[PDB]
Every structure is written in C-alpha cells, then in structure tokens.
Ligand binder design. Structure first.
Ligand SMILES: C[C@]12CC[C@H]3[C@@H](CC=C4C[C@@H](O)CC[C@@]43C)[C@@H]1CC[C@@H]2O
Ligand SMILES: C[C@]12CC[C@H]3[C@@H](CC=C4C[C@@H](O)CC[C@@]43C)[C@@H]1CC[C@@H]2O
Lengths: 240, 8, 230, 10
C-alpha cells in the first residue's frame, strides 16, 4: 500500500536505538567476562528488535506462528548486520556499543571467536567500500527478516513458513525500493543491477556468519562459560 | 514462550 | 573477453554429468547404508566439479591457493544446487541419481536428515515456481563458486561477479522481461543463494556429526573438503 | 592435498 519513499521513511522511523554496555567491566578482558557483556547486550537488543519487527511493513499481516518462525530464523542476522552497520566508520574495529569498541586482536579472548570477528569486519569493510547508505541498510535488514525463514526448516520444529506468496510480494516491493534508491544516487541502469547484486550477495555471507555464530554460542553455553538469559536462551534453543 | 508472548 | 552469449555458451559446455548410484543397494535403507550411498556419490562428483571449475571463465587466472579456498567454501553449495536442479520435475522427491529417487519419508532413516531434505525439496519447488531456465542455473552456480569464499580470504572476483550479473540481466532482457521484472527476478534468484548457503551450513554440521558416529566411509577427497570447515 | 593435486592436473 505504501510508496517507495513511504517504505523508506517507515523503516527509518522504526530503527531501534543503540544500547550501551557496562561502564566498568573487568579491565583485563576474560573469556567469560567478554561473552557476558556480549550476551547481556544481545538480550537487551532482542527486546527492541521484537518491537521493530512489528513495525516492518507487512509483518503484522502474518499469523502468529509465522511471525515467530521468521524471528527465530533471523534474530542473529539482524543483530549482526546492525553491528556491521555502526562499525562502518571504524576500520578494523567493531562497534558493539559506543563504550565497547573492540578490535580484532581483542576478539581472541574467546576461543574460536576471532574467525567470526574477521568475518564481521570484512562485511563492514565492504559496506564502507560501496559507501552503503542508511536507506539501503534499513532495506536489507527488512529483507533479512522476511527472507531468512521462508524456506528454512528449523531443527527444533521440523516445519517452515506458511504464507509463502505474501512474503515474496513484500520482498518485491523492497526490491523496487532498493532500485529506486540507486536511481536517486545518479546510478545508471547497468550500475543499478550490479549494485543490487552486490548488496544481496553479502546477505549470503551474513547468513553464513549467523550459522557460525549460532554454533559458537551453543558451545559457550554447553561449556558453562556464560549463563544465557531466558529470552536469548529461547532464541538459541529454537535452532537445536 | 517469551517471544511468543512479547509479540502478542 | 567474452560477451554475454559467449559466457552462457562456455558455462553450458562445461556442465558436469549426472552420475549414477549403486544399482542393487541394501533394500531396507539404514542410516549407515544411506550415508554410504550419498557420500560415495559426493566423492565421485567432487572430481567432476574440480574440472568444471577450471572451465569457469576467470577461475584459472586465479592463484592456485585462491582456487583451493573457493572450492573449499562452496563445494557443498554446488553439489546441493545441482541436486535441486535435477529434482525440479519430481515433486516431493530428490533425484540424487537417476536410480536414487528418495522422498522425505526415506530420509527419516538418517538422524537429522529430514529437515535438510525438506529444505532441499523447498528449494526445488521454488525453482519450479519461478520456471528457472538452464541458462540461469549455470550462472547461479558460477556465482556460488566465486562468491561463497570471497569474504574469508578480492578485486578480480568482484569484476567477474559483475559480468555474471550482466549476463543474467541479458538473459532476462532477451526473454522479453521488462526492466522492473529484471531486477525483481534477479533479486529472487540471489535471495535463494542465501538459503542455499544456509543449507550447506546445516549439511556441513550433519556430515561432521555422522563422522563422529563413524558413518562416513574413508572417502579421502570428501573428508578433505569437510576437514576444511573443521 | 588431494584437491591441491587435482587442480594443477592436466
Ligand atoms: C553469539 C556471539 C555472542 C553475541 C554477538 C555475536 C556477534 C555480533 C553480535 C551483535 C551485537 O549487537 C550483539 C552481540 C552479537 C549478537 C557473537 C558470535 C559468537 C558469540 O557466541
Ligand atoms: C552431506 C550429506 C551427505 C551428502 C549429500 C548431502 C545432500 C545433497 C547432496 C548432493 C548430491 O549430488 C550428492 C550428495 C549430497 C552432497 C547430505 C546432507 C547431510 C549429509 O551429511
């Protein structure tokens, strides 16, 4: 129902805030102290994401069981692309919070984690190279919410999404919205399909990062490294 | 069923 | 140096064959018997994919270390999209081989296999719903080979990826699709690549878990590809 | 090692 510019303004209006971490954590970072700060932040961000998802145009039209399936499928992708976005203007650093600017070497405090640090930093380095605009970013974040669970059969449920036809209709609108934004940037027709392709190809790498980060967080819970808050626990448990 | 509740 | 038509012609000429499975398998499928059939077929297809990659325009011009990385990150995505392609005209069944037609019920014999089966069947049905053409399929396979590992090593691979994007757009334009239809269909194809990447991730963990149950036979090449993700 | 040899093959 909304126009292309109405689509962008609505997505910009629903943007979640940038939360903070603890103002005086353990000064020498440890494996448990690091994972505690990250899981505490993610659990607080998840509450703001649920309210943001309800404002994504077309999300409220789905049934309740279709709404949950899309959120358990893409909650880590959305949190990761949000971190990559605010880490754009910080080369070699990840802006987890304004008071938690972590570098690549500091990611080695958690075992098997720097591999994901490098993948997130490479994603941020590419957005910087293509000069990603904020209107393009909110578009890609909404694509992740609607597309990451359309064909996905979660192991904890063995079922997928029902309203397939409705999701692809909204996804076509965001595709037009993306192309519309590339035109306002003065890009040519050829430059439009190429940039649209490069943007959606990074969504594959973000999907890969979420699966690698999901297995890592599961091992951290099984190793008693960090307790998981009930909401973050339920989001992770939806994949096992 | 926390996300199940916060959506409603 | 190749135009759009020359790129499609080269990709179609280099297509790997469809291999066969065992002609007299264990009639009651077991988790071990089923895992042995799929792993034996994957190990034979890997030799064919290595040779298919060398004929992908621009792949030979990479360094030998770069060629290994791209094949290590995308070998399962390539094997899966090939299975999804040949299973299009068989609803509810996955055509692993012309003599191996399995549904989701037969996948219940392997622990944790049914969800991967359902995800593969869902991709095949979507390919059927979009009326995917063989010319578009070979372009998507070349994109997977070059894109899956670019963000784990860069400039040369992005230029080849842009040419395949130009090639896909040229195919839809020559098929009578309007410009709006062109970016809409291009986005629908590239979004499926995100699900194929997700399927290879889940399948990689399953093969790893089946090796702990000692179900994977000693297929050295397949174990080498799987070892690259451990 | 095997993928290494099969790539430089003729
Ligand atoms: C899930 C991990 C902890 C939480 C991390 C994730 C990487 C990126 C982000 C986004 C940020 O907004 C919150 C933390 C969050 C969600 C990490 C990858 C490995 C580790 O287990
Ligand atoms: C890798 C698995 C065995 C091999 C299977 C894969 C699903 C799809 C394919 C493609 C087909 O061409 C060969 C077998 C292959 C590669 C399976 C998913 C779970 C199991 O571990």
């Amino acid at each position: 129902s909304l126009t292309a510019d109405q689509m962008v303004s609505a997505l910009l209006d629903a943007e979640p805030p940038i939360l903070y971490s603890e103002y005086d954590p353990t000064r020498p970072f440890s494996e448990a102290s690091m994972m505690g700060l990250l899981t505490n932040l993610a659990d607080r961000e998840l509450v703001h994401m649920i309210n943001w998802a309800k404002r994504v145009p077309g999300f409220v039209d789905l049934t309740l069981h279709d709404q949950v399936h899309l959120l358990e499928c893409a909650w880590l992708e959305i949190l990761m692309i949000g971190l990559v976005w605010r880490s754009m203007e910080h080369p070699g650093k990840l802006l987890f919070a304004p008071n938690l600017l972590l570098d690549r070497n500091q990611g080695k405090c958690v075992e098997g984690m720097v591999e994901i640090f490098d993948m997130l930093l490479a994603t941020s380095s590419r957005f910087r190279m293509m000069n990603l605009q904020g209107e393009e970013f909110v578009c890609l974040k909404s694509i992740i919410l609607l597309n990451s669970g359309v064909y996905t059969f979660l192991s904890s449920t063995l079922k997928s999404l029902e309203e397939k036809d409705h999701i692809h209709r909204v996804l076509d609108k965001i595709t037009d919205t993306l192309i519309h934004l590339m035109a306002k940037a003065g890009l040519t027709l050829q430059q439009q399909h190429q940039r649209l392709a490069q943007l959606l190809l990074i969504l594959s790498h973000i999907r890969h990062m979420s699966n690698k980060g999901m297995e890592h967080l599961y091992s951290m819970k099984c190793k008693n490294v960090v307790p998981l808050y009930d909401l973050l626990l339920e989001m992770l448990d939806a994949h096992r | 069923k926390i996300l199940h509740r916060l959506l409603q």
